[PDB]
Design a protein around this nucleic acid. Structure first.
Ligand SMILES: [Zn+2]
Lengths: 101, 50, 66, 97, 64
RNA sequence: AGCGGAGAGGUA
DNA sequence: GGGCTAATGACGGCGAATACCC
DNA sequence: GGGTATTCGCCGTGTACCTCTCCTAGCCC
């Protein structure tokens, strides 16, 4: 929701390239680009404000809704990075990861 | 803004409102207040501006 | 929480206790010289909140980037 | 009205529009052509990337103005990243070579 | 802006030369006689050329 | 608490 | 009232697709 | 075989600003 120490992370990307190439997409490229599949259409759960598991707005596929936090609250600190849970496996990374993958 | 003809100015210069000049050049005002030493932090300089 | 480095400088390291931010410059022995607090919700601007910390870690004897 | 620092959106890292909610004035499509007719690539790159669209340049230019140094960093905007992530969702491979 | 049209033939080369001159006065360089008007006066006074700018840039790179 | 899209009216 | 539960008042230009007299 | 003759479908139509309201909805207790 709110990040403070992430604002001063300067010089993170260079983006040095020469050309732009476009072609068709192989199915293996689509299977390697993604991080999981979806099976139940539900973008917002009702009577509680939590993302639906394996839905349109999911946490086990894309990432966490809150920065450096998980869904349940077992790992709620910045000292734990890259450690997923067991009942709701979310990578404890930055909030920028929800736009890339 | 709304344009208004002014005859007492040269063709290499133009007019500008004071509140617009304060709101546009506000980081330069903050840098000048930091360089002159009249305000320690940017919060005190912003409170002195407002 | 625990003290986490900014990784924009080599001298100072800060923390975050919710919606407020605090920093503390330190020498090679680990002794704190100055320590203040900043409110991000009171400012209402992200680059001004960046420049606040970047000036507080500049005027109070802060070592720049390597 | 006037503004220097305002709110940004979620899809593209751009300021809003209008006198309400602190929205900056839209740089038109023909204004970019009028700027490019003069040449002046330095005032066209600084008014398109480091002013509004970049998520790091918008802080770095403010830090350089408040501090006093003059060293800008050029990079790709976030809107091109949103466009290539939208094109990649159409089973069409597009990679920045 | 009118005197600088006679010392150089290209306007964009004049803009790039004044941009290379403006990166030195910000870090602190004693002037010849706002940094923009001072750099334009130093260009129009027929004192600052492409060799002296390279000399001060090499001295800054050696004294960095 | 910031961020969205439609319909109508008005100035240049 | 309530709480989850799922039209026909546009107009011009250009490229493919049968198809009809030759 | 064959070389156009209608015919169907796709493409598009200026810029910027100011103000107001209204949006997912519905159905048998
Ligand atoms: Zn969890």
């Amino acid at each position: 929701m709110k990040d403070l120490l992430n604002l001063f992370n300067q010089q993170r990307q260079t983006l040095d390239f020469d050309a732009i190439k476009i072609a068709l997409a192989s199915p293996d490229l689509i299977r390697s680009w993604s991080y999981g599949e979806v099976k139940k259409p539900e973008t917002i759960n009702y009577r509680t404000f939590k993302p639906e598991r394996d839905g349109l707005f999911c946490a086990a596929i894309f990432g966490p809704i809150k920065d450096y936090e998980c869904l349940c609250g077992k790992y709620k600190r910045m000292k734990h990075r890259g450690v997923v849970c067991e009942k709701c496996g979310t990578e404890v990374t930055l909030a920028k990861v929800r736009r890339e993958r | 803004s709304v344009i208004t003809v002014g005859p007492y100015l040269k063709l290499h210069q133009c007019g500008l409102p004071k509140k617009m000049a304060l709101e546009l050049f506000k980081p330069f005002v903050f840098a000048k207040l930091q360089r002159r030493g009249l305000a320690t932090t940017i919060k005190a300089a912003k409170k002195l501006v407002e | 929480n625990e003290f986490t480095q900014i990784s924009g400088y080599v001298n100072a390291f800060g923390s975050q206790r919710g919606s407020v931010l605090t920093v503390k410059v330190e020498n090679d022995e680990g002794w704190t010289l100055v320590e203040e607090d900043f409110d991000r919700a009171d400012y209402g601007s992200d680059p001004e909140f960046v420049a606040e910390v970047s000036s507080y870690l500049k005027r109070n004897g802060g070592i720049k980037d390597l | 009205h006037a503004r220097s620092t305002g709110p940004y959106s979620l899809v593209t890292q751009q300021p809003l529009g209008g006198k309400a909610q602190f929205g900056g004035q839209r740089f038109g499509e023909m204004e970019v052509w009028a700027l490019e007719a003069y040449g002046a690539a330095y005032t066209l790159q600084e008014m398109l990337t480091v002013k509004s669209d970049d998520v790091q340049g918008r802080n770095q230019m403010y830090k350089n103005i408040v501090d006093g140094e003059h060293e800008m960093v050029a990079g790709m905007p976030e809107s091109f990243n949103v466009l290539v992530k939208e094109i990649r969702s159409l089973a069409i491979h597009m990679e920045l070579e | 802006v009118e005197d600088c049209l006679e010392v150089v033939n290209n306007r964009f080369e004049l803009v790039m030369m004044a941009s290379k001159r403006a990166r030195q006065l910000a870090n602190g360089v004693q002037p010849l006689i706002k940094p923009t008007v001072m750099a334009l006066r130093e260009i129009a006074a027929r004192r600052i050329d492409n060799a002296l700018i390279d000399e001060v840039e090499k001295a800054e790179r050696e004294r960095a």
